[PDB]
Swiss-Prot record, chain A:
Coiled-coil residue windows: none
Site features described as Essential for function, chain residue numbers: 68
Protein name per UniProt: Ubiquitin
Location(s) in or outside the cell: Cytoplasm; Nucleus
Modification Phosphoserine, positions: 65
Site location (Interacts with activating enzyme): 54, 72
Substitution effect: residue 72 to G: No effect on ADP-ribosylation
Effect of residue 68 to G: Loss of DTX3L-mediated polyubiquitination of histone H3 and H4
Range covered out of full length: 1 to 74 of 128
Record cross-link Glycyl lysine isopeptide (Lys-Gly) (interchain with G-Cter in ubiquitin), residues: 6, 11, 27, 29, 33, 48, 63
From Swiss-Prot, chain B:
Full protein name: DNA polymerase iota
Family named by the database record: Belongs to the DNA polymerase type-Y family.
Role played: Error-prone DNA polymerase specifically involved in DNA repair. Plays an important role in translesion synthesis, where the normal high-fidelity DNA polymerases cannot proceed and DNA synthesis stalls. Favors Hoogsteen base-pairing in the active site. Inserts the correct base with high-fidelity opposite an adenosine template. Exhibits low fidelity and efficiency opposite a thymidine template, where it will preferentially insert guanosine. May play a role in hypermutation of immunoglobulin genes. Forms a Schiff base with 5'-deoxyribose phosphate at abasic sites, but may not have lyase activity.
Motif stretch (Ubiquitin-binding 2 (UBM2)): 8-25
Tissue expression: Ubiquitous. Highly expressed in testis.
Tree of life domain: Eukaryota
Record note on domains: The catalytic core consists of fingers, palm and thumb subdomains, but the fingers and thumb subdomains are much smaller than in high-fidelity polymerases; residues from five sequence motifs of the Y-family cluster around an active site cleft that can accommodate DNA and nucleotide substrates with relaxed geometric constraints, with consequently higher rates of misincorporation and low processivity.
Record note on modification: Monoubiquitinated. Protein monoubiquitination prevents POLI binding to ubiquitin via the ubiquitin-binding motif 1 and ubiquitin-binding motif 2.
Subunit structure: Interacts with POLH. Interacts with REV1. Interacts with ubiquitin.
Subcellular location, record wording: Nucleus
């Protein structure tokens, strides 16, 4: 299942993923494309902060789902 | 009156949760 990631600047990215993919993996996808590291980028879905210890299916995320990326400070 | 950096879009900002909204506004204010 794929998911769209809109950044704070409006940059939309489509990354193919799987229902058992870990949030830490999706974050790496934006890293290889947007060059943003995991310790600073944050993914939020429905006002909920995704945890690096869970899977997309655990957050009820489905294909064509869109997530929000928030930049940290470090 | 809200001021957004040259790299922040308002459409995606209001779509973020308030708790995170405040943290991002507090950062633009401490330096703003």
């Amino acid at each position: 299942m794929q998911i769209f990631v809109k950044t704070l600047t409006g940059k939309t990215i489509t990354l193919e993923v799987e229902p058992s993919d870990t949030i830490e993996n999706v974050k790496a996808k934006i890293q290889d494309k947007e060059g943003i590291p995991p310790d600073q980028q944050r993914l939020i879905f429905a006002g909920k902060q995704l945890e690096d210890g869970r899977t997309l299916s655990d957050y009820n995320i489905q294909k064509e789902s869109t997530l929000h990326l928030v930049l940290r400070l470090r | 009156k809200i001021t957004f950096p040259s790299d922040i879009d308002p459409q995606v900002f209001y779509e973020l949760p308030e708790a995170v909204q405040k943290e991002l506004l507090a950062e633009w204010k401490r330096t703003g």
